[PDB]
Amino acid sequence: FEYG
Amino acid sequence: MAIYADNSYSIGNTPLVRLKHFGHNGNVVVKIEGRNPSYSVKCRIGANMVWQAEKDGTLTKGKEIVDATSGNTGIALAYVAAARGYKITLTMPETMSLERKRLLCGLGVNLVLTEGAKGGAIAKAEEIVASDPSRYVMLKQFENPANPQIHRETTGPEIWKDTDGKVDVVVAGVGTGGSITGISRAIKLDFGKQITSVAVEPVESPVISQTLAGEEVKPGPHKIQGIGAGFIPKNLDLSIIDRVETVDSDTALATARRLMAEEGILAGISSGAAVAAADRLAKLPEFADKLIVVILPSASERYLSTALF
Ligand SMILES: Cc1ncc(COP(=O)(O)O)c(C=O)c1O
Ligand SMILES: CC(=O)OC[C@H](N)C(=O)O
């Protein structure tokens, strides 16, 4: 999981 | 009487439970935010962001909701939209658990999902509200002050009340930062007690730790759904954070499994990360007799599709  | 006018008003009043196999002689207590409508901590801001937008007139009948979510905020806004009579469109990374995707559609959302590699969700959403700016209202959970405000008004006061003011430490994973921000503001500023506010982020994407240390900010991928946005969100008040703890995805998952198997607590992945962080502090003599309260953001069944199970 990353940006948001 | 104590009958709520719709499901949005029933937010909060979540219980504190003492852990038996973590911490040192019961100094670790967990706040189970899974006991909420839509069954995560985000129900609180789903409600208040809508309530606030209604009260400043940005949200009216006929206007359609937009935001970007890693899931729980999406499910939260969806139950509130359904309860209060709004249409709603949401954006989300492809990689979020199937459960999140599953009930968002059942709640009647016009769903729109983005590149998992980009995390990305925030980008197109804005590109969508531009389509008809007085048709759509974007609630923007990462910067909307109604997010930490409801935590200052409910989550923090509940913690203060239920611990009889004895809480010494609050541990909370950071996604938007709203939870640790609002809670810390309530206890430190409204009730006046100098606690230790502890932010938790994935060791894989420790952008808060890197920032404060003045190092190269290098976000990375991780499995701890709901935290580790890979940037510093506006709704994280860095000034009120005393400590940052990093936790790896494996340990987060193992700890969530332990919460289930050893404590009978049905916690989500980020709940395992928060407890792992709390357990480390709890076993420092310096915290060995402080009361440590840990936010458990969500519940197990929302993660049956993931590594948790
Ligand atoms: C499962 C989960 N854990 C932790 C968090 C972080 O909470 P906050 O956005 O208040 O920092 C979130 C945020 O939605 C979440 O969904
Ligand atoms: C930081 C993150 O993963 O997402 C923000 C919040 N968890 C949401 O429900 O969208």
Side-chain angles (χ1 to χ4, degrees), chain B residues 41-42 70 72-73 100 141 147 151 173-180 226-227 270 297-298 303:
Chain B
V41 63
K42 280 313 169 284
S70 74
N72 283 331
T73 291
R100 283 153 165 84
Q141 64 165 332
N147 174 346
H151 293 294
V174 169
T176 71
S179 299
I180 190 61
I227 72 173
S270 73
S298 62
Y303 305 83

Side-chain angles (χ1 to χ4, degrees), chain A residues 1-2 4, chain B residues 96 119 222 229:
Chain A
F1 299 104
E2 309 204 30
Chain B
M96 300 297 177
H222 65 87

